[PDB]
Ligand SMILES: O=C(Cc1nnn[nH]1)Nc1ccccc1
């Protein structure tokens with residue numbers, strides 16, 4: 667009886683195994699655009715993905731992760747609200763059964779069709795496992811997806827999903843350039859939060875881009891053909907793998923833009 671996104675094991679149940687689910691800095695949250703304050707002291711974000719080395723794509727039963735070589739400072743996030751250097755370890759998405767839901771963060775209660783998370787860890791803690799134990803251990807860059815025009819840089823991802831249909835399957839996924847997943851603008855909102863899956867650790871500086879990327883209906887349809895289940899088990903389509911908005915509590919969302 668492991669955690670997931672079904673009626674019997676979904677987000678409303680997670681607190682039983684992970685009591686931090688009811689903590690003071692849980693993610694995601696609704697971004698109230700009229701309450702978020704422009705902070706003129708934030709910096710431009712520095713996304714340095716020229717030297718990124720993707721390795722593999724894995725269906726973990728919750729989502730699919732595109733994994734990077736994080737054994738040196740190749741693909742790093744710096745600047746914005748961050749102090750020091752955060753190394754890209756993986757990206758993944760959360761998405762819906764239909765285009766009216768799927769994102770984890772919301773914007774004035776609007777849900778996007780999906781949300782991309784590029785997960786990075788603070789190199790001052792030496793490894794990812796040590797970083798998740800610290801309040802400034804991770805930086806997650808979140809990007810909303812809307813359905814419209816195709817995203818050319820997403821198609822290599824879409825076209826490998828047939829090969830990782832079920833839980834525990836992986837495929838070689840070298841030479842993928844994550845720069846092709848970014849919008850034009852790096853304007854962002856930031857706040858202190860958590861991982862949005864168990865273990866829900868309160869170790870993330872969230873950086874959520876204002877500008878969504880457009881993907882095609884055909885692209886997201888292929889996401890929705892993945893399976894939560896393992897090979898040969900009853901089919902459970904991998905859809906609605908998002909945690910809803912959590913209480914903001916004693917937190918301020920800051921905007922990089924006026
Ligand atoms: O990547 C996620 C999902 C997520 N968290 N925050 N946004 N997405 N979780 C996770 C990563 C490493 C180890 C344990 C859990």
Ligand SMILES: [Zn+2]
Pocket residue numbers: 758759760783862
């Ligand atoms: Zn995520």
